[PDB]
C-alpha cells in the first residue's frame, strides 16, 4: 500500500483527519503497528525508560538509539519513522544537531527526527530543515507568561521549518488555539483533544509498563499482564512436564 | 526474594525441578518475566531478528547487544541474566572470546554468557570458565555420525566448564540420553521433554512475531495480536475525537 | 584526442551544441562511454540505488563513492568526470563541503563535483569555486511561487560560480527560460528539450534496471535483457556440457 | 522461489547437475543474474580490473569490495553470494583471514568467502570453516611436479573444509581427475569441461570489456557494444534536438 | 521519601529555611549523608586535595571526577547531587563548558554542575542553563572595587540562569546584602551567617584531614582521629593474636 | 622513619611478627593509616563497592583505580602500597597482566600489585615477578578436593614468585598449615588467626558501610555513625542559625 | 621559606626591589637555583638550543617542554615557575593558546606561562588571564616607528592582563620609560638596567654553552669549563687505574 | 676526529685501555663531554632522578627520554651514544624490546641501547642484536648463590650478543673475574677497578646533585656549588643595579 510521507500529515490537517502516532523501539513491535495501520512511528528517547531502565531520558545515547531505529525502520515499511534526538546531541548548535540528525538518517534510516525545544532551538531546526531533513518539533508548557512562551515556541518552531510539532503537557485550551493558529499539524500527548494528531508511548497505551497510567494516557489493554500469564503458564507446564509435548 | 545463581540450576537438576528459560531483550520485558518468576533470562542473538529485523544472526554486533543486556539486567533483579556472544566474537580463540565475554560482564552487567559451539570451542569455554565467567554452552545436531558428534560436543563442552548446555534441534532420544549422561543441566529448545530445563524466544512463546509457530514452539498466547487492536482501536478513537477525552 | 574541460561546455552553449551527459559508476562502463564519445560523466549518488541497492540516496557515503570515482576516472581519459557530493557532506556549510570536495579531487581524481541545492547552498558553491574546484550545480522544482524559487536558485547558483547547472524535474517552459537567462550551460533530466545539455542515468538509458522507464527517460536499448539471455544461455550450455568446449 | 545454499551445490554434484557461476559487482547486475537463474554469484577481486581499472588484483582493498558485496547481496536474494578475499588479507595466518572473512559476512552480508591458495592456506580455511564460515577454495596449476602440487592443494583444501574449489588454468586432464577424486564440487574456469560447475567473469561472458576474449572464455554476446550505440545514438539525438521529445 | 530538586532550594529561600550542603566524593560517604538528611551533595574539585593528594585544584581532571560522581549519585538517592567542573574544562567558552557538563550529567549521573567564575563566565552559564542543565554558580571576593565586582558577578551569574550561587571567602556584610538582593539562594562558606544555605568540605567538618581547622570551618567531630585508634587497636590485636578470634 | 618494603614482610614472618594490612582508596584515608602505623595498604577492587557503589567487583575498571592509587600513594609515604588488578585485566595471559601491572606502577605509583587466582595464574605472576614487579597473590577455598586445590594454588602461586599471598575465606585449619608450609607470608581475611598477617576492608573495620559485619570482620568502631551525627548536627546548626558563628 | 607568587613581583616593583629571573630546564638545575634563592624560574623555549641542539626555537614542541617543566617544578618548591609557550601553540587564537597553557598548568605543574608577542596577542593573553592563568608577556624591538610599536605592545599586553612583561633587545632608553610607564614589572634581557627585574639563560650566565658571551650577557663563571676538567680528569684517572680506588 | 664505534671498545679491551663512560641528558652537557674526549655517553634512565625529580627510575617513560637522546646525539658527534631502555619497555619479550629499541635508534638517533637484566633478558638481547642493534647489557649482584647468578647473567648476556656489559654494585672480586672471563668489555660502577671501563652519573661525578657522594662515586668537583654562587652573585648584582651594566 502507501508509504506515509510528511505531506500526508499536512493533507490530513486540511481534510481534518486526526491521525495517531505511536512510539516504537524494535522490529517486531514496529511490524505490528505497521500492519495495524499506524502511519507514524516515533523511536523516542522515552526508550531510555521502557527499553533501558534509566529513570530519566538524560543518560540515553545516540548509540543506544540508532540500532533501534534501524530495527523500527525495517519493521514499518509503510510508516513515517521519526528518530528522536537524545539529550545533549543538539543543544550545542546547528552543526552538532545536523551531524546527529544526519547519523539518524544515513545510518538509522529514519525519515525524520524530533528535536525537543522552543525558540532557543529554532536555529537548529532551520539548519536541518534547510539540509533537507524533516524535523518534528516538540514544545511544552512550563508554569501565565508560560502560555505566551509556549505560543512563541510554537510559532518560532514552525517558522524554522518543522513539518509538525508535538505539544506535551500543554493546557487543552492553549493547545486548541495553537493548533488552529499553526499551519503545520500539532501532535498532542496530554495536550487535549484539539490537536491534528495524538501520540502515546506504546508501553502505556497497551499496559506494558507498571500499572500507573497517568491522566493523559488511556490504557487500551493489558498486554503486559497477558504476557505475565503466558510466561507463568509456560513455566508451570515446563515444571509439569506438560511442555514440551511430542508435537514439539 | 532470591536471586537465581548458577548453583540453583544445578540443585534443580538434582531435585528434578524442570526450570524455564525465556529470551529477553529490553527493560520492560525483563521486568515482566522477572515478576512472572522466570529464573533465567537470555539476551539472545536471536535479537538480530526480533529486535533489529536481520534475516539472520550473522550481522548482529556486540554493540547491538550490550546496551540491551544492560536494560535486561536492570529489569530482572532476581533472574540469572545470560548474555549471548555474537557471531565472530569468539571463534578466533580464547583471547578474543575472553575479551568479548568480559565486556558483557563488566559493561553489560550480565551474570553469564552463552557460547555456541561444540568441541572446537572447548578451549574458549575453558579460558572463560577459569577466568571466573559462567559459561552456558550451546550444541546442536547436524545430520548417524551426527549423533556421535553431538555427544562429543556435549561431553567436551561440559569438560570445558560450562555450568549448563543448550541442546537445539536435537533428536529427543539423543537429547534424553545426553541429559542423563551429563552432570550439568541441559536446556532444550526443540530437543524433546527430557531436558533439565526449556528455552524459547519469548516472541514465539507469546505470538509476537509472524504467525508461523514452528513445531518445537507452543504458542501460549497472541500478545502480538492483542497489541494490534490496542493500536487499531487507539487510532480510531483518535480519528473519532473520542481520545483524548477530558480525563486526559 | 581532446580531453573535455569545463570551458568546452561553455563554448558549446555559445555554438549551440547540445551535449550529452551520462551517469557512470565503474571502470568498464566509463571506458565504453569514453570510446563512445560521451564528453561528461557523472559518478552520481544515484549509484546508491543502481550500485548498492539502497531505495534512496540518503544512505550512500563518501566512501562508497570515492573508490567508484577513481575507477570512472581511469576509464574515461577524455571525459570530464564529475563527482557527486553525497547527502550530508555539504549541508553543514562551506568548510564541510570544501573538505568533501577536496577528497573527491585529490583522492577520487574527479575534475569537478556536483552540489545539489538552491540559494541555501550558494555559500558552499562560492567557497569551492574560489578554491579552484569546478562546481556543477543542481536545482529543482518543488510545487506558483515554486517557479520563482527555481529561478532564484538558478540565479544564485550561477552567481556562486557554478560552471553549469542541472535542472531536474523542472517544467519545460520554466526550464527553457532559465536556460536562455543563464550564461552557464543548463543540463536537463526531465527538464524539457530546451537545455544546453541532457543527462540520464545510464541504467535507465540502456534498460539495465527494472522495466519502469519514467516519462523523462527514453529507453535506447535493453542491455539488461541482453545480459539475461547471455547468462541464461551460458548456464544452459554449462548444464549441457556444451561449455566449456575444447577451444576453452 | 528457493535460495541457493552450499548443500545444494553438493546435491548437484551427486545428481550430476553442472551449475553455472557468474562474477558480479553491483546491485543492478546481480538483480539481472538472479532473475536469470544464476545460483552462485562471485564478488571477485577481478573487480580490481573491471570495476576499478587496476591492471592487477594486487592493489584492491577490502574496503573497495565490502560495499560492492552489500550491493550484490541486495540484488540476488536467491543466489549464494561468495565474497573473494583480497590479496594480503589472509596470507598472514588464520587470525587475519578470520577477521577479514568475518567482515565480509557481518558487514558485506556475504554467505561465503573465496580464499585463493593451496596447501599453504589450509590452516586458514580450517579456522574459517570451523568458525562456521563457508569457504570456497581456489587452486591453480603453475608449471610435471606442478600437477602433483595441484593435486596436493585440491586434497589439502578439501580436507581443510572448503565446500567447493575453483580450478583456474588447470589442464583439463588433471582437472577431470581431481573433479572425480574430490567429494566437493569443482568449479572451473579454463579447467576443461569436467568440473561440477563453471565460472566466468561476466564482463568477458557478455563482451563488456575490451575485445580480447581469451581461449577459456566464450563470448555469449556483445553487451558492451550494444551499450556503445545506445550511448552514441543518445548523444546524436541530444545534438539533433530529437531528445528529449515532449513525452519527456 | 522526597528527592531534593532545585525548586526546593528556591522554596526554602522563601520559607526562610537555611539548608546545609556537604561535599562528598564516594558511595559510602554519600550513603551516610543521605540517610543523615543532607539535601545537597557537592562532588567538589576539592577532591583534588582530600581524595588525590594534589596540593591544588589545578591538576584534577574530569576523569578523576566522573567516576566519583557516579558513586556519589548511587549513594544519595534523595540528595541533589552537584558535580563541580574541573579547572580548564569551561574557561574556553560555552561549547567546551556544555560538553563537559553534559558528560557529568549523561555519564556522571549528576543533577547539576558547579561552574566557578564571575561575569566572565555568564555566557557559559547561559548556554548550559538554556540546554536544561542546572548550574550552581560560584563567586568570590578578591581585594574596595572588589566588593563591586563580587556584586557584579552575583548579578551576572544569576542573570545567566544559575539556580543558586556559592559565596566563598566573601565579607559577611557584603554577603548579607547580596543574599538579600538576589532571587536565587546563596550558599556560603566563609561568607558569614547571612546566606540561604551553608557548605563545607566534609573532611574539615568532621576532622578527617589534618588538624588545622581554618576560621570559617567548625570542627563538628574528630572522625579522623576515631579512625586512627580503630586502626591502631586493630593492628595491636592482630599482633596480639587477639584478632581474629574464633567468632571470626 | 622507615618505608615498608616487601623484604620487611619476609623478616616479620621470620621474627614471628604478625602485621596488619588495611584497604585504602584515597589520600586522606591513606594519610591517617600511615600516621597510624599501618605498614601495608591495599587499593582494593573492593573499591567497586565502597567507593563506586557497584554491587560487585566485576565492573570496576583500571581507570577507576589508577587515580585512586596515585592518591593513596601520596598519602602513605611509609606504607607499602599494593594495587589490585581489576577483573579482566590479567586473565588473558602474561602480556595483558604485565601491561596492566606496569600501568599501576609507572602511573599509579604503586609498589606492588595483587593478582587474584590459583594455579591458572602462575604464568602471569611469573612474568610480572621476573619483570621486577612485586606480586601479592590471592587464593581462596571453593567447596574435600577443594582443600587440595587451595594448597596447589598456594604452592604454585609462591613458586611463581609472589612475595606474599592472601587467603580469603579459607578454613582456619587449612590456612594454618598453608601458612606453616609456605616460605612467604600469608595474609588472611576470614582465614583464621594463623596467618603471618591480616587484612580487612577499612570500611568494615571502622563501621563505615552498612551495619552487617560478617563473621570474619570485627567492628573496631562506628566511624560511619560518628559521621552521621557530625552531619546531622551541622545541618541543624545551619538551620538554627547557630552556624556559622562570627568566629567563622 | 616563602613560595614566590605573582603578587610578590608586584610588591617588589613598589618597594623598588630588583629581582633576578633565571632560565631552568631540569630538576637538578632548578634545585640549585631554588636553594640559591632565585625567585622566578623560566622553562624557556630557549631549551630548544641548550637542551635539544636545535639551531632555532621554531622546532621545539610542547611535548619536549612539559616533561622538563614537571622536573623544574619539582626542583624549585619556592620559585615561581613560568612555562613558555612553544612557537605555533598560541598564534592561532585564544582557544588554541588556552588549551596549550592549560596543559602546562594541569600537566606541567607550572604556575604561569610566557606568551611571546605584541598587540596581535592581546586577545590570547586576555583569555588565559580571565581563565585564571598568570601570563608573563614578552615584547621586543624590531627596527623609529619601532619604538612606537614596542610601546603599543607594552601597553596592550598589560591591558590584556599580563602580570609582568619581558623586554628583549629593547633600547635601554625606551625600556627605561616603558618600565616607568607600566604598572606591572618589566623583566629585561638586553633591555638596559632600568627594568623591575632581569632575566638570563643560565647556560650563558654560567658559561655552559660555547664561549661567545654576547653584549647583554655577563659571564658570572665558567661552569662549563669546570665540567670539562672534571670529565677529563675522571677519564685520565680511569685510564690510569687511579679510579676507582678501594674506597669505591 | 674519530667517531667512537663499538669495535673501538673491543680493541681497547685488547690493548688494555681503560675507557671512561659518562651519563648525559642534554645537548649542552653532551657537547662538553664530547670536546672533553669522553668516548661513550649514556642517556640513562637515571635521568628520572636528576632530570625529572622522580625518586625512582620506575616512572620515567620512553617519551621522556627520546627527546633527550636526540639532544645528546646532536651534542656529541664523536661519542658512541647509548640509549637506555626505560622500565617496562622490554620485559614483555623480544617484540616489545625490539620496537622500543627501534624507536631509540630511528627516532632518538642513538647508536646503541642499554637493556638491564640477567639471563631472563637474553632472548631480548638476541633479537635486537640480530636485528643489527648494538646492545649494552647491565647485570648486578643481589644477595653466595648470588655470585653464581651474576656469573650466569654475565655469560648469558654476552652469549646473547651484547657488545659490552655494565656491572653495577658487584663485588670487586667477582667483577675482576667476570671481566677476565668475558670476551666483551665490562663497564663498572661500584664494581671495583678491574673492569675494561668505568661509568658514573655525571651529576655525581661533578657534584651537581645533593652532597652525599656514595662510596662508589668520586666527587671530581663541585660544579653544582659553583653554579650556586654564579646565581647568587648574579641575583645580588641585579638587586644592586650593578647588572646589567652599560656594556650590556
Ligand atoms: Mg527528551
Ligand atoms: Mg547464535
Ligand atoms: Mg543527490
Ligand atoms: Mg586473487
Ligand atoms: Mg574550582
Ligand atoms: Mg577482585
Ligand atoms: Mg619564542
Ligand atoms: Mg633500569
From Swiss-Prot, chains A, B, C, D, E, F, G, H:
It is found in: Cytoplasm. Binds 1 Mg(2+) ion per subunit. InterPro entries: Pantoate_hydroxy_MeTrfase, Pyrv/PenolPyrv_kinase-like_dom, Pyrv_kinase-like_dom_sf. It comes from the Bacteria. Mg(2+) binds at residues 45, 84, 116. Its EC number is 2.1.2.11. Catalyzes the reversible reaction in which hydroxymethyl group from 5,10-methylenetetrahydrofolate is transferred onto alpha-ketoisovalerate to form ketopantoate. PANTHER family: 3-METHYL-2-OXOBUTANOATE HYDROXYMETHYLTRANSFERASE. This is 3-methyl-2-oxobutanoate hydroxymethyltransferase. It comes from Mycobacterium tuberculosis (strain CDC 1551 / Oshkosh). The lineage of its organism: Bacteria, Bacillati, Actinomycetota, Actinomycetes, Mycobacteriales. The gene is panB.
Amino acid at each position: 500500500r502507501t508509504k506515509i510521507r510528511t505531506h500526508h500529515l499536512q493533507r490530513w490537517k486540511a481534510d481534518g483527519h486526526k491521525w495517531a502516532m505511536l512510539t516504537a523501539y524494535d522490529y517486531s513491535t514496529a511490524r505490528i503497528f505497521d500492519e495495524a495501520g499506524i502511519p507514524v512511528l516515533l523511536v523516542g528517547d522515552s526508550a531510555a525508560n521502557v527499553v533501558y531502565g534509566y529513570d530519566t531520558t538524560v543518560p540515553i545515547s545516540i548509540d543506544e538509539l540508532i540500532p533501534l531505529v534501524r530495527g523500527v525502520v525495517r519493521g514499518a515499511p509503510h510508516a513515517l519513522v521519526v528518530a528522536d534526538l537524545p539529550f545533549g546531541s543538539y543543544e550545542a548548535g546547528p552543526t552538532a544537531a545536523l551531524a546527529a540528525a544526519t547519523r539518524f538518517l544515513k545510518d538509522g534510516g529514519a525519515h525524520a527526527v524530533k528535536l525537543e525545544g522552543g525558540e532557543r532551538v529554532a536555529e537548529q531546526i532551520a539548519c536541518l530543515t534547510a539540509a533537507g531533513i524533516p524535523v518534528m518539533a516538540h514544545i511544552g508548557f512550563t508554569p501565565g507568561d508560560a502560555a505566551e512562551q509556549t505560543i512563541a515556541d510554537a510559532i518560532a518552531v514552525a517558522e524554522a521549518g518543522a513539518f509538525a510539532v508535538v505539544m506535551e503537557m500543554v493546557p487543552a485550551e492553549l493547545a486548541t488555539q495553537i493548533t488552529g493558529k499553526l499551519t503545520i499539524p500539532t501532535v498532542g500527548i496530554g495536550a487535549g483533544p484539539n490537536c491534528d494528531g495524538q501520540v502515546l508511548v506504546w508501553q502505556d497505551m497497551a499496559g506494558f509498563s507498571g500499572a500507573k497510567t497517568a491522566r493523559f494516557v488511556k490504557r487500551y489493554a493489558d498486554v503486559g499482564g497477558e504476557l505475565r500469564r503466558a510466561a507463568m503458564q509456560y513455566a508451570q507446564e515446563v515444571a509439569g512436564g506438560v511442555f514440551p509435548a511430542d508435537e514439539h
